[PDB]
Amino acid sequence: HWGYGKHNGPEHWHKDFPIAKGERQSPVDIDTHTAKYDPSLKPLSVSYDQATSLRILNNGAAFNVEFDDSQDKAVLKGGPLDGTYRLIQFHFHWGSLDGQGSEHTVDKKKYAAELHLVHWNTKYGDFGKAVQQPDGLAVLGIFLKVGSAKPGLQKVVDVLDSIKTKGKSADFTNFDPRGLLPESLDYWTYPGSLTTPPLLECVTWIVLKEPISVSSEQVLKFRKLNFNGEGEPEELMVDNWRPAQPLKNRQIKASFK
């Protein structure tokens, strides 16, 4: 099955998921000088004060921190969005080295990692219905660079030992995702897709201009995770990123000048 190895990586995904060669695939390179400032874009509204985190799961592709999305407790609104989008989970993509790991790139620059806060449009009732709609999901993407530690990430880093292998989970209550945001919510936005199979073209991407800084030790700990299940040969969970895909007939809009 699909993965991030030589034999099942992104270049192979189209054989099982032909939408991999679709018209609105993600990620993309954000060419900052081709993007256009759109003064009609509103400030993002990130309302996470009442967020209820539940669990952290190694799903074999990344680790997901999952939230209670049965009510409007942690929501994204505004920006390019029409309506209310509920946070369901966040996860990261990262590299084997600090110079790669992000899915989106900025003028071809790759960051060490990229955080995805995944939200679904409440008018569609459930996430499964939402992924079948062109405006079903809103994903807030945040780049990670290596420098000073991110204090609000350390609770995540410290629990990874307990979910080393695929299928493992652990309680992860009372986590505040506001601690993973940069200072500025300036962003780029474009229509795209899930970046893992089934690669559905259901996402409004909102990628923050300002990276967060994490320490070398924090991202090092991501790299100790395993793609494999317990009892199987150890395959480090590194380079779990899809490379940039062609922009095709899309425009990237900037919320800032």
Which residues bind to Zn ion, rule: CB under 5 A?
Answer: 116
Q: In terms of CB distance, is 110 or 116 closer to Zn ion? A: 116
Nearer to Zn ion, 38 or 223 (CB): 223
Of the pair 104, 232, the CB lying nearest Zn ion is at 104
Residue 109 is given by DSSP the state: B
Q: Tell me how far apart the alpha carbons of residues 183 and 204 are, in angstroms, rounded to a whole number.
A: 22
What is the closest distance, in whole angstroms, from the C-beta atom of residue 257 to Zn ion in the complex? 28
Minimum gap (Å) between residue 242 Cβ and Zn ion: 9
Min CB(64)–Zn ion separation in Å = 9
Q: Which CB, 116 or 209, lies closer to Zn ion?
A: 116
Q: Count the Cβ atoms, other than its own, within 10 Å of residue 27.
A: 24
Whichever of 86 and 116 has its CB closer to Zn ion, that residue is: 116
Beta-carbon-side half-sphere exposure of residue 77 (alpha carbons within 13 Å): 10
Q: Nearest distance from residue 241's CB to Zn ion, in Å? A: 9
Q: How far is the CB of 91 from Zn ion (least distance, A)?
A: 6
- Is the Cβ of residue 38 or residue 145 nearer to Zn ion in the bound state? 145
Strands (E) located in the chain: 29-30, 36-37, 44-47, 53-58, 63-67, 75-78, 85-94, 105-106, 113-121, 137-146, 169-171, 187-192, 203-208, 212-214, 253-254
- The nearest distance, CB 37 to Zn ion, in angstroms, is 26
Q: 3-state SS of 120-181? A: EEHHHCCHHHHCCCCCCEEEEEEEEEECCCCHHHHHHHHHHHHHCCCCCEEECCCCCHHHHC
Q: Nearest residue by C-beta to Zn ion?
A: 116
